[PDB]
Nucleic acid binder design. Structure first.
Ligand SMILES: N#Cc1cccc2c1[C@]1(CC2)NC(=O)c2c3c(c(O)c(=O)n21)C(=O)N(Cc1ccc(F)c(Cl)c1)CC3
Ligand SMILES: N#Cc1cccc2c1[C@]1(CC2)NC(=O)c2c3c(c(O)c(=O)n21)C(=O)N(Cc1ccc(F)c(Cl)c1)CC3
Ligand SMILES: [Mg+2]
Ligand SMILES: [Mg+2]
Ligand SMILES: [Mg+2]
Ligand SMILES: [Mg+2]
Ligand SMILES: [Mg+2]
Ligand SMILES: [Mg+2]
Ligand SMILES: [Zn+2]
Ligand SMILES: [Zn+2]
Lengths: 368, 184, 368, 184
DNA sequence: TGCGAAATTCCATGACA
DNA sequence: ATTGTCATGGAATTTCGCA
DNA sequence: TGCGAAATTCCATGACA
DNA sequence: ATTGTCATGGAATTTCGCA
C-alpha cells in the first residue's frame, strides 16, 4: 500500500495514523518520529512478511514477537497483525501449552442402589506372586463394596472368568470402565449383552472418570504396602484379607462401611456394630433404605480464576496421548459438535471422526 | 430373644460325586439360615482342604457367627475346627443319621438338588459354567412364607434379574427317559 | 485397672467418668448405658490391645479406627489412646501420605552480574542425531544467556570438554547443578578447583532448585519441537540455531533479551534494537549497569491454608526417591538438625547421616 | 558519525601451520574491532569449510555487521561469500600484500602471535588444550589506550580471572635456545 | 446461662502410573 | 455418547458435663 | 476534563521426565 | 550446606489521541 503512504507524506489524515506526528521520506522509505524513536512505516503489502519474519525467529507469542517488530517499525494496530499470524501458525498452535484451566469438576450422583453401577479397573503389573501380576478391582458405585481378583494379564478372558464368579451373587445394570483393551473387546461386549449389562466407557486418557475404582486402587495398594513391610511382596494371599479389611472400613464422612451399605448389618468380623440387634430384618432393611438416601453428596467446587467451558462450534485441540520425543503435545484444531455436559464434548477432528473427549484433554485454540 | 439376621448361621453340605465338569466332581452348598441366600462352590473332593479353600472365598465377603453341618469327615476334622476357631466361627453339628436344619433351609436344599438334576440331564459335564445362573435362579426365587426372595432379604432391594418365569423343576417324560438312558 | 473400675461399680466418682451415667456389671464385665447404647468399659490394662486390634484391621486413621472401637467399648478420652497407637505404627508412618503442603517457595535473588552463577543440566536421551543423544544446557543466572552442547552421554568427560570451550570466553564464580553423576564426580570437582569455580549442588530430587536451567530446557525443547514438525527429529544441526534464537528472544516481563543483558547491545541479528546508536560504548555500558539493577524480581507467594514450616528438633520423614512396587513412599522418622532457610533443612536419619534436603521431599511425622 | 560498538567489525585471520596438536594445525583468529575481544578456533586447514565450521560456532553467540580479512583463499571463495550473504554479514578485504586493520587490532594480533610462540616452546604439540587459557589471558589484558580490558568493554563488568601478573611475552635465553633447538 | 474440655465436623492435601 | 474420589490428621466448631 | 480505543501491564496456567 | 522459573494470551488497567 504505497498509495496509502503517499497521501501521508503530502500531509492529509489517514484513519489509524495520528495527525500529531511527522511522517517523512528518508533512505527511500516512509518514516515517523515517535516518542520511542524514528520507526519505518512499511506499506500494508509488506507487513504480513515482517510479522512472520519476527515471529519465526523463535516462534514467539504476542509481546515477544511485537518487541522485535517495534525495534525497526511502526504501523497502526500492530498487535492485531501479530495475533493474525499467531493464530495461523500451525507449529505454535500444536506445540504451545494452554494457559486456561478446565471448568470445575462434576460430582456425578451416587448410584441409587447396590448393583446399579460397577466401576472396574486393573492394578498392575505388580511384582509376580504365584504367577499373578494383575488385580481386577470391581467397586459397587453405591456402597463402595469391592471384589478383588488376581490375574496373569489385564485380558478379556481373565475379566470374564472373574466377573462370571462375581455375577453369581447379583447382576449389575451398568459396568463402567476405562478404554483398556480387556473391556473394549467385542468378546466382552458380547459377554455383557448376553447378561443384559450396559457397558459405559470413560472418555479416553481420563482416569478421574473411573474415580470411584481409582480411589479404591490407592487404598488396596496402601494396605498391601503396610502388610508387606519388611517381608517379600507376596500379595496374592493377602488379596482376600485386604478385600475383607477395606469392605469393613468406615468412611469417616459417611460413618458407614461398604459392608453396612450393602447388607445393612455387620457379619461376624471384629468390632461388629450391634445397634440393630432388637430390630427385625424388615425394620433393619427399612433403616438401611433411609441411610442409603441420606448419604453426604459433594457439590462441584468453585471455578478457577481463568477456566474455560466448551461451546458448540468452538475450535479446540485434543491432547496427544503418548507424544514422542520432540513432537507436539497437541493435535490440530477440532470443532465442538455437541456439549454433552460442561466437562464432556463430542468433537470432529480434520479426518472427520467423532470423538467423545474430556475437557481435561482439550485446550481452546488460541487467537480464535 | 433377638430376631433372626443374615450371617447368624450358614448351613453347609456337599453335593456329589457328580459327573466331572472342568475337573470338578462336587458342589459345596452354603445357605444363609435367615435369608435363604445360596453360595455354591465346585470342589474336586469333599475334603477339609477343599472346604477351607472354598469357604476362604466366601468368608472374604461375609463371616457367619455359626456354621451348621452334618458329621461329614471334612467338617468334623481338627483342621476345619482350627480354621473356624481362627475366624471366631462356632461349629454346630446335627446328630449322626439325623440331619436337622430348618424348614426354609431343608426346602432350599431340595430346590438346589432338583434344579441341579433338571439341568444336568442332557449336559451332565457342563454344570461348572451353569453354577452362576443356578445361584441367581435360587436367590431370585420368591419365598411364600417370608414374601421376599433371598436377594431382597440380603440386600434390601429388587434385583436386575427377577426370575418371573417360575419353571417346572420337575422332569419331562423326555428328560426322565434321557436321565434313565444316562444311568447305563 | 480392675481397681479403678471397682470404685466405679460401688458408685464413687473417678476423674474422666461422668457421674450422670449408670455403671454396672453384666456377663463378668463393667458396662455403661450411654446415649449411643450400652458399651463395655475395659480396664486401662486392656485398652492398648483393643486400640491396636481395631487399628490393625485395615491400618486406619483416627476416626475410622475410633468408629470400630466405639461399636463395642467406651472409656475416657478414647481418641487420645487411638492417636498414641497411630503415632507408634511404623507401617502407617512410612506408608501414609502427608496432608500438609510445603511452605511458600523462596525467590532467590537474581545473581548481580553475568558469570556470577551458571545453572547447568542435561536434556536427554533424545532421538539419536549424528550419534548424539544429550544436550548440555548452561544458563547464566543474571542474563539468562544459554550455551548448548550436544553430547553422546551425560558424563563428566562430555561436561568438561563443553565447559573448557565455554570458559574460553569467561570463568564463572559458581556453577549450580543437580546431583547428576556427571557433576558430583571427583574429576569434575578437580576440574572446578583447578579454575577457582565453586560447585553448588541442588538438594536431591528437587529440580525446582535448578529452576533457572529447567525453565530454559522447556523453551529449548519447545523450539526444537516446532522446527522439526513434519520432518525427522534431526536436532543436532538445530542446536546452534535454537541457541541464537532463544538468546535474542525478549522476556515480556523484563523487556530485554538475554543477549542485551549480557552485552548491552544487539549484534547483527534480525530486528536488532537501534536505541543506543548515538551513545558511546561507555554511555551504553553505564545504561546497561542501570538496566541490570532495576530488573523485576518476584516475591514469595502466599502460604497455602495448611502449610508446614520446619523447626529444629522436629520429627520429619524424607520421601523415598524411587520406591519399589508395593513399598513405602517415606523413610523412617529423622530429626531436623538445622533449618538452613524455611525451604531447606539438615536432617539426621536413624543411620546417623547428615542430609541437606528440600522440604518438598519431607513430611512432618504425624501424631508428634 | 556514530560511535564504534562491539560486533561492528570482526577481523579474522589464520595462524599456521603449527605443530600438530590433537590433529589440528591452524588457529582461526577472530578479534572484535571495538573491544579487542579475541575468539580462537583450531582448524585442520585454512579452508573455506574450516572457516565456515568455526565461524558457525561464533555466529551462534554474536553476528558481526562486517568481517574483515586479507585476500586469503578461504575468505575470497564464492562459498564464503554465500555464507556471509546468508547471515547479512558484509565482507571487507584489505588490498593484496597490504594488510590493514586498526592500531588496536594490529597490536592484538602481535600479542596473539607472541603469546602463542612463548607457550609453544617446550610443548609445541599441546597448544589445543591451552587455547582457553590463551584467550582468557588476552581478553583480561588491560588496554593502555582505552583504560579497559576487552572483557570489561564487551560485558561491562570486571572478570573473575583478572590477569594482574603482566608476563614478559618476550622469550628467555633458555626459551630462545630451546626454540632454536626445535628448528632442527 | 456459661465455662473448660472433649467430641465431632470440616476440609486441604494428595494419590489412584 | 458422558461425568473424579475419599482417607487423612490438624483446625474449627459443636456438644458435653457440670453448675 | 473526559471519552473510546489502543497499548501496556497483569498474572494464572503449566512444563522443565 | 542451600533456595523455582518464566513464556503465554485473555483480562485488567493505563495511556493515547483528540477535543
Ligand atoms: N498405563 C496404562 C494402561 C495399560 C493398559 C490399558 C490401559 C492403560 C491406560 C488406559 C487403558 N493408559 C493410561 O495411561 C492409564 C492410566 C490408569 C489406568 O487405569 C489405565 O487403564 N490406563 C490409571 O489408573 N492411572 C492412575 C491415575 C492417575 C491420575 C488420576 F487422577 C487417577 Cl484417578 C488415576 C493413570 C494412567
Ligand atoms: N531422570 C533422571 C536422571 C538421570 C540422570 C541423572 C539424574 C537424573 C535426575 C537426578 C540426576 N533424576 C530425576 O528424577 C531427574 C529429573 C530432572 C533432572 O534434570 C535430573 O537430572 N534428574 C528434571 O529435569 N526433571 C524435570 C522437572 C520436573 C519438575 C520440575 F518442577 C522441574 Cl523444575 C523439572 C525432573 C526429574
Ligand atoms: Mg485402567
Ligand atoms: Mg486405573
Ligand atoms: Mg446331610
Ligand atoms: Mg539433571
Ligand atoms: Mg532437568
Ligand atoms: Mg594478513
Ligand atoms: Zn510459530
Ligand atoms: Zn498402622
Amino acid at each position: 500500500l504505497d498509495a496509502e503512504l503517499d497521501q501521508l507524506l503530502q500531509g492529509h489524515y489517514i484513519k489509524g495514523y495520528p495527525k500529531q506526528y511527522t511522517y517523512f521520506l528518508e533512505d527511500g522509505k516512509v518514516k515517523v518520529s515517535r516518542p520511542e524513536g524514528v520507526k519505518i512505516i512499511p506499506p500494508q503489502s509488506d507487513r504480513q512478511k515482517i510479522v512472520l519474519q519476527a515471529h519465526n525467529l523463535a516462534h514467539t507469542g504476542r509481546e515477544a514477537t511485537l518487541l522485535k517488530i517495534a525495534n525497526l517499525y511502526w504501523w497502526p494496530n500492530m498487535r492485531k497483525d501479530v495475533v493474525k499470524q499467531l493464530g495461523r501458525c500451525q507449529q505454535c498452535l500444536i506445540t504451545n501449552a494452554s494457559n486456561k484451566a478446565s471448568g470445575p469438576i462434576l460430582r456425578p450422583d451416587r448410584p441409587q442402589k447396590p448393583f446399579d453401577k460397577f466401576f472396574i479397573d486393573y492394578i498392575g503389573p505388580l511384582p509376580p506372586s504365584q504367577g499373578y501380576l494383575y488385580v481386577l478391582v470391581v467397586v459397587d458405585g453405591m456402597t463402595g463394596f469391592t471384589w478383588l481378583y488376581p490375574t496373569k494379564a489385564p485380558s478379556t478372558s481373565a475379566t470374564v472368568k472373574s466377573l462370571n464368579v462375581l455375577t453369581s451373587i447379583a447382576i449389575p445394570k451398568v459396568i463402567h470402565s476405562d478404554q483398556g483393551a480387556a473391556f473394549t473387546s467385542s468378546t466382552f461386549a458380547e459377554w455383557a449383552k448376553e447378561r443384559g449389562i450396559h457397558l459405559e466407557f470413560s472418555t479416553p486418557y481420563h482416569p478421574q472418570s473411573s474415580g470411584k475404582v481409582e480411589r479404591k486402587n490407592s487404598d488396596i495398594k496402601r494396605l498391601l504396602t503396610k502388610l508387606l513391610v519388611g517381608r517379600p511382596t507376596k500379595w496374592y494371599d493377602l488379596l482376600p484379607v485386604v478385600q475383607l479389611a477395606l469392605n469393613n472400613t468406615y468412611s469417616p464422612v459417611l460413618k458407614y462401611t461398604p459392608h453396612q451399605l450393602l447388607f445393612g448389618i455387620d457379619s461376624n468380623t471384629p468390632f461388629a456394630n450391634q445397634d440393630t440387634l432388637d430390630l427385625t430384618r424388615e425394620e433393619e432393611l427399612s433403616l438401611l433404605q433411609e441411610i442409603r438416601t441420606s448419604l453426604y453428596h459433594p457439590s462441584t467446587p468453585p471455578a478457577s480464576s481463568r477456566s474455560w467451558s466448551p461451546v458448540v462450534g468452538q475450535l479446540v485441540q485434543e491432547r496427544v496421548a503418548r507424544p514422542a520425543s520432540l513432537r507436539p503435545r497437541w493435535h490440530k484444531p477440532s470443532t465442538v459438535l455437541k456439549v454433552l455436559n460442561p466437562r464432556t464434548v463430542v468433537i470432529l477432528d480434520h479426518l472427520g471422526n467423532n470423538r467423545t473427549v474430556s475437557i481435561d484433554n482439550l485446550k481452546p485454540t488460541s487467537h480464535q | 430373644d433377638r430376631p433372626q439376621k443374615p450371617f447368624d448361621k450358614f448351613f453347609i453340605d456337599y453335593i456329589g460325586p457328580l459327573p466331572p465338569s472342568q475337573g470338578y466332581l462336587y458342589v459345596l452348598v452354603v445357605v444363609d439360615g435367615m435369608t435363604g441366600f445360596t453360595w455354591l462352590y465346585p470342589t474336586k473332593a469333599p475334603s477339609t482342604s477343599a472346604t477351607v479353600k472354598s469357604l476362604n472365598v466366601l468368608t472374604s465377603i461375609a463371616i457367619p457367627k455359626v456354621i451348621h453341618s452334618d458329621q461329614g469327615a471334612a467338617f468334623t476334622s481338627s483342621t476345619f475346627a482350627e480354621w473356624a476357631k481362627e475366624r471366631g466361627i462356632h461349629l454346630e453339628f446335627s446328630t449322626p443319621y439325623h440331619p436337622q436344619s430348618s424348614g426354609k433351609v431343608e426346602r432350599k436344599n431340595s430346590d438346589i438338588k432338583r434344579l441341579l438334576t433338571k439341568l444336568l440331564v442332557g449336559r451332565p459335564t457342563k454344570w461348572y459354567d451353569l453354577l452362576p445362573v443356578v445361584q441367581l435362579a435360587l436367590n431370585n426365587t420368591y419365598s411364600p412364607v417370608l414374601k421376599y426372595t433371598p436377594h431382597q432379604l440380603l440386600f434390601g432391594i429388587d434385583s436386575n434379574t427377577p426370575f418371573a418365569n417360575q419353571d417346572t423343576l420337575d422332569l419331562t417324560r423326555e428328560e426322565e427317559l434321557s436321565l434313565l438312558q444316562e444311568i447305563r
